[PDB]
Design an enzyme around this catalytic site. Structure first.
Site, short mmCIF file in Angstrom:
data_model
loop_
_atom_site.label_atom_id
_atom_site.label_comp_id
_atom_site.label_asym_id
_atom_site.label_seq_id
_atom_site.Cartn_x
_atom_site.Cartn_y
_atom_site.Cartn_z
N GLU A 1 0.80 -1.23 0.17
CA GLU A 1 0.03 -0.14 -0.13
C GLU A 1 0.81 1.33 -0.02
O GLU A 1 0.69 2.08 0.85
CB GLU A 1 -1.01 0.12 1.13
CG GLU A 1 -1.81 -1.27 1.11
CD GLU A 1 -2.92 -1.29 2.23
OE1 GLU A 1 -2.87 -0.41 3.08
OE2 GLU A 1 -3.74 -2.07 2.07
O1 LIG Z 1 -7.34 -1.78 5.98
C1 LIG Z 1 -7.18 -1.25 4.82
C2 LIG Z 1 -6.50 0.23 4.78
O2 LIG Z 1 -7.59 1.17 4.97
C3 LIG Z 1 -7.27 2.65 5.02
O3 LIG Z 1 -8.07 3.45 5.10
C4 LIG Z 1 -8.85 3.88 3.99
C5 LIG Z 1 -10.50 3.68 4.03
O4 LIG Z 1 -10.63 2.36 4.10
C6 LIG Z 1 -10.99 4.10 2.70
O5 LIG Z 1 -12.58 4.03 2.80
C7 LIG Z 1 -10.55 5.55 2.36
O6 LIG Z 1 -11.13 5.84 1.23
C8 LIG Z 1 -11.38 7.43 0.99
C9 LIG Z 1 -10.25 7.98 -0.13
O7 LIG Z 1 -9.07 8.21 0.89
C10 LIG Z 1 -10.60 9.32 -0.46
O8 LIG Z 1 -9.59 9.65 -1.38
C11 LIG Z 1 -11.93 9.35 -1.27
O9 LIG Z 1 -12.26 10.48 -1.64
C12 LIG Z 1 -13.44 10.73 -2.77
C13 LIG Z 1 -14.59 11.04 -1.99
O10 LIG Z 1 -15.19 10.24 -1.05
C14 LIG Z 1 -15.45 11.43 -2.96
O11 LIG Z 1 -16.58 11.85 -2.44
C15 LIG Z 1 -14.93 12.46 -3.95
O12 LIG Z 1 -16.00 12.68 -5.03
C16 LIG Z 1 -15.61 14.00 -5.89
C17 LIG Z 1 -15.30 13.30 -7.19
O13 LIG Z 1 -13.89 12.71 -7.00
C18 LIG Z 1 -15.49 14.75 -8.17
O14 LIG Z 1 -15.12 14.11 -9.66
C19 LIG Z 1 -16.50 15.23 -8.17
O15 LIG Z 1 -16.44 16.65 -8.97
O16 LIG Z 1 -16.86 15.70 -6.74
C20 LIG Z 1 -17.41 14.69 -5.92
C21 LIG Z 1 -17.93 14.88 -4.80
O17 LIG Z 1 -16.62 16.05 -4.02
O18 LIG Z 1 -13.62 11.77 -4.78
C22 LIG Z 1 -12.86 11.36 -3.81
C23 LIG Z 1 -11.59 11.03 -4.64
O19 LIG Z 1 -11.54 11.54 -5.92
O20 LIG Z 1 -12.97 8.95 -0.28
C24 LIG Z 1 -12.74 7.55 0.37
C25 LIG Z 1 -13.92 7.05 1.31
O21 LIG Z 1 -13.76 7.94 2.46
O22 LIG Z 1 -9.38 5.84 2.46
C26 LIG Z 1 -8.45 5.56 3.71
C27 LIG Z 1 -7.04 5.77 3.53
O23 LIG Z 1 -6.98 7.38 3.51
C28 LIG Z 1 -6.06 7.74 4.64
O24 LIG Z 1 -4.77 7.92 4.14
C29 LIG Z 1 -4.50 8.39 2.74
C30 LIG Z 1 -5.15 10.05 2.96
O25 LIG Z 1 -4.99 10.58 1.90
C31 LIG Z 1 -6.31 9.89 3.57
O26 LIG Z 1 -6.74 11.39 3.71
C32 LIG Z 1 -6.53 9.36 4.90
O27 LIG Z 1 -7.74 9.44 5.51
C33 LIG Z 1 -6.27 2.44 6.16
O28 LIG Z 1 -5.69 3.94 6.19
C34 LIG Z 1 -5.02 1.51 5.85
O29 LIG Z 1 -4.05 1.68 7.08
C35 LIG Z 1 -5.35 0.23 5.76
O30 LIG Z 1 -4.24 -0.55 5.25
CL LIG Z 2 -1.55 2.15 -2.25
#
Ligand SMILES: OC[C@H]1O[C@@H](O[C@H]2[C@H](O)[C@@H](O)[C@H](O[C@H]3[C@H](O)[C@@H](O)[C@H](O[C@H]4[C@H](O)[C@@H](O)[C@H](O[C@H]5[C@H](O)[C@@H](O)[C@H](O)O[C@@H]5CO)O[C@@H]4CO)O[C@@H]3CO)O[C@@H]2CO[C@H]2OC[C@@H](O)[C@H](O)[C@H]2O)[C@H](O)[C@@H](O)[C@@H]1O
Ligand SMILES: [Cl-]
Ligand SMILES: [Ca+2]
Length: 511
Positions: free
Chosen positions: A180
Site C-alpha cells: 500500500e
Molecule cells: O485496512 C485497509 C486500509 O484502510 C485504509 O483506510 C482507507 C479507507 O478504507 C478508505 O475508505 C478511504 O477512502 C477514501 C479515500 O481515501 C478518499 O480519497 C476518497 O475521496 C473521494 C470522495 O469520497 C468522493 O466524495 C469524491 O468525489 C468527488 C469526485 O472525485 C469529483 O470528481 C466530483 O466532482 O466531486 C465529488 C464530490 O466531491 O472523490 C474522492 C476521490 O476523488 O474517499 C474515500 C472514502 O472516504 O481511504 C482510507 C485511507 O485514507 C487515509 O490515508 C490516505 C489519506 O489521503 C487520507 O486522507 C486518509 O484518510 C487505512 O488507512 C490503511 O491503514 C489500511 O491498510
Molecule cells: Cl496504495
C-alpha cells in the site's frame, strides 16, 4: 418461487487457479487453503535480521516483536535472523501452499523493539536501519547486526540457500513490493512522511525487482499492492500525477506501461503479478459492509456487493459507483488494463474482505466471491481478517469449496458455464476436474432473507448423472453439514429447494 439453472460442462471451460483459495491470517486451519501471504502494514518496516517491525498508525508507531508473537515464535526463535519468514514458509511447506512474502521498499526497517517512535524520531534516526536492495558484497547467512543496513538481496539469498529457488518444490514462490505505497505517508509517516510519487514508486519498484530477480529469476514479483480505488485512480493524488498522467486513464495504466518499459530496458520481466487490495465501499442501511455486520439492508448489500466484481448491470451504493462507474465492474476493468499495457501479467487480489465475518451474510458473500474469482481470470486472492478471533462464516465459505466433507474434498479445477434465471436472489458456480464426465460440482446459494426457491437444474454432459450428495451451511449452523441427497435424477434434470440464506455444494455422479 422457481428459478432455473443451466449447467453446460462442455461450455466456457477455464482453469480455476487454486491460489484464489488464499489467505493472509490463517483461519481455523481446516480450510485447505492453497496460498498464504505474509503482508500488510507490519511488513513495510519488517527487519529480517532481528524480526522487529513497526505498527505505524495501527498502534502507536510502535517498533516491537509483534510478528514473532503472531507467528508463534518463542523469544529465542525471535532472535534468529529471518525466523518470522522461515517459520511462515515452513508452515506453507507443511500445508502445501504457495508463499507470498513481502519485501520492504518504503526505505527503512525497524532497528529495535523499543516501542513508539515519535514524529521527530522519523527516519533516518536511531530507531531505523536503511534498506539497500543490492549488497554488492559477499552475502552472510548470519547478517551483520551492528551496522545501519538491511540488504534485501542478502535476505533473498538466505531464503534460496535454505529452500532452493522458486522453480523448486520447496522454494518461496512470490515476493511483493512492500504494501500500500499510496498509504505510506498515512500508515507509516515515521518511515516515509511525504506522499509517494508515481515516478518514485516505479523507480523504487524497478530497483527492488532487479535485485530480487538477480538472486531468483523464477520468483514472481507482485506490485504495486494498491490499497483501494483512490490509489488505482491516481495513486492517492500523487504530487507528480498531473506531470506524468499523459493520456493514461488511471495510475493502473501508467504503472503497467512503465514497468513494461523498464523491463524492456533491463532485458527481463520485472513485474509478474499486478497486485491490488479491495475492501468494498458498498453501503447498505447507512453502513459500509466492511465496517460492521449492520442491519438487514447492510446484510442484503453485503450479499449483492460481489456483483461489483463482474456484473455490468450492477451499481452498488458507494462513492466509487457514484463518481467512477466507468471503472466498474472491477475485475474486467483491471484485466482490460493488464492485457493492454503489460500483456501476460497476472492479477491478484491480495487483501480483501466483505465483512459480516460471523454472519450468514458474510458466508454467502464469500461463497459467491470465491466462485467469481475462480472464473474471472484471477491468479491469487488472499482474505484479510478485519475482525479478530474466529471468522466462522468466512471459514465456512472456504470449507464449502475446499473441505466440504471433512476429508479436504474440493470444488473442481475447471470452471464450466452455470447460468441462473435470477442473479439477484441466487448465485451459482459449476466445475469439473480434468474434463471429468464422472463428477460435477455445483455451488449454489440463496441470498434472499425471506424466501426459499426451488432450483430446477438442467445439466449438459457427456454421461447421465444419476445421483448427488449435498453439503451446506446456513444461518443456523456455520459448520458444513451433509444435507438430503439427490437420489433420483431423470434426463439430467433435477430440482432442489434452497432455503433463504443457505449455501450448498452439490456433487453429482454418473456412477
Ligand atoms: O485496512 C485497509 C486500509 O484502510 C485504509 O483506510 C482507507 C479507507 O478504507 C478508505 O475508505 C478511504 O477512502 C477514501 C479515500 O481515501 C478518499 O480519497 C476518497 O475521496 C473521494 C470522495 O469520497 C468522493 O466524495 C469524491 O468525489 C468527488 C469526485 O472525485 C469529483 O470528481 C466530483 O466532482 O466531486 C465529488 C464530490 O466531491 O472523490 C474522492 C476521490 O476523488 O474517499 C474515500 C472514502 O472516504 O481511504 C482510507 C485511507 O485514507 C487515509 O490515508 C490516505 C489519506 O489521503 C487520507 O486522507 C486518509 O484518510 C487505512 O488507512 C490503511 O491503514 C489500511 O491498510
Ligand atoms: Cl496504495
Ligand atoms: Ca545489518
Amino acid at each position: 418461487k422457481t428459478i432455473t439453472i443451466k449447467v453446460d460442462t462442455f461450455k466456457d471451460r477455464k482453469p480455476i487457479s487454486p491460489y484464489i483459495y488464499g489467505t493472509n491470517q490463517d483461519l481455523a486451519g481446516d480450510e485447505n487453503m492453497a496460498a498464504r501471504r505474509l503482508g500488510g502494514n507490519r511488513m513495510t518496516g519488517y527487519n529480517w535480521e532481528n524480526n522487529m517491525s513497526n505498527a505505524g498508525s495501527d498502534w502507536q508507531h510502535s517498533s516491537d516483536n509483534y510478528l514473532c508473537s503472531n507467528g508463534g515464535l518463542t523469544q529465542a526463535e525471535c532472535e534468529k535472523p529471518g525466523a518470522v519468514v522461515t517459520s511462515f514458509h515452513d508452515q506453507s511447506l507443511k500445508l502445501g501452499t504457495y508463499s507470498l512474502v513481502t519485501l520492504p521498499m518504503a526505505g527503512y526497517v525497524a532497528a529495535d523493539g523499543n516501542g513508539s517512535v515519535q514524529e521527530s524520531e522519523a527516519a533516518p534516526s536511531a530507531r531505523w536501519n536503511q534498506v539497500v536492495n543490492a549488497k554488492n558484497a559477499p552475502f552472510q547467512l548470519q547478517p551483520d547486526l551492528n551496522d545501519n543496513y538491511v540488504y534485501v538481496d542478502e535476505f533473498v539469498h538466505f531464503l534460496v540457500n535454505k529452500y532452493g529457488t522458486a522453480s523448486t518444490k520447496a522454494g518461496v514462490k512470490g515476493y511483493a513490493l512492500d504494501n500500500e505505497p499510496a498509504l505510506w505517508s498515512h500508515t507509516h509517516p515515521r518511515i516515509h512522511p511525504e506522499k509517494v510519487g508515481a515516478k518514485e514508486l516505479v523507480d523504487r519498484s524497478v530497483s527492488l525487482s532487479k535485485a530480487v530477480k538477480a538472486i531468483d529469476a523464477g520468483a514472481e514479483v507482485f506490485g504495486p499492492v494498491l490499497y483501494g480505488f483512490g490509489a488505482y485512480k491516481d495513486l492517492q493524488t500523487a504530487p507528480d500525477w498531473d506531470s506524468v498522467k499523459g493520456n493514461y486513464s488511471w495510475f493502473v495504466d501508467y504503472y503497467l506501461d512503465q514497468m513494461r518499459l523498464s523491463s524492456q530496458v533491463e532485458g527481463k520481466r520485472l513485474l509478474d503479478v499486478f497486485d491490488v487490495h479491495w475492501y468494498p465501499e458498498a453501503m447498505g442501511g447507512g453502513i459500509r459492509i466492511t465496517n460492521e455486520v449492520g442491519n438487514d439492508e447492510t446484510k442484503k448489500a453485503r450479499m449483492q456487493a460481489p456483483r461489483t466484481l463482474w456484473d455490468p448491470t450492477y451499481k452498488e451504493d458507494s462513492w466509487i459507483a457514484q463518481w467512477f462507474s466507468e471503472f466498474l465492474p472491477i475485475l474486467p476493468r483491471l484485466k482490460q488494463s493488464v492485457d493492454k499495457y503489460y500483456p501476460g501479467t497476472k492479477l491478484a487480489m491480495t487483501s480483501y474482505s466483505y465483512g459480516g465475518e460471523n454472519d450468514i451474510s458474510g458466508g454467502i458473500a464469500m461463497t459467491d466471491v470465491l466462485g467469481i474469482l475462480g472464473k474471472n481470470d484471477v491468479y491469487m486472492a488472499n482474505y484479510w481478517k478485519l475482525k479478530d478471533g474466529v471468522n466462522n462464516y468466512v471459514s465456512a465459505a472456504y470449507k464449502l469449496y475446499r473441505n466440504y466433507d471433512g476429508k479436504n474434498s474440493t470444488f473442481g479445477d475447471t470452471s464450466v458455464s452455470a447460468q441462473t434465471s435470477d442473479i439477484v436472489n441466487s448465485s451459482v458456480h459449476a466445475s469439473v476436474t480434468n474434463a471429468s464426465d464422472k463428477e460435477l460440482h455445483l455451488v449454489v446459494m440463496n441470498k434472499s432473507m425471506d424466501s426459499a426457491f426451488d432450483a430446477q437444474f438442467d445439466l449438459s454432459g457427456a454421461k447421465t448423472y444419476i445421483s448427488g450428495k449435498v453439503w451446506g451451511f446456513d444461518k443456523n449452523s456455520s459448520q458444513i453439514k451433509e444435507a438430503a441427497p439427490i437420489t433420483q435424477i431423470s434426463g439430467n434434470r433435477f430440482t432442489y429447494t434452497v432455503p433463504p440464506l443457505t449455501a450448498y455444494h452439490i456433487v453429482l455422479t454418473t456412477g
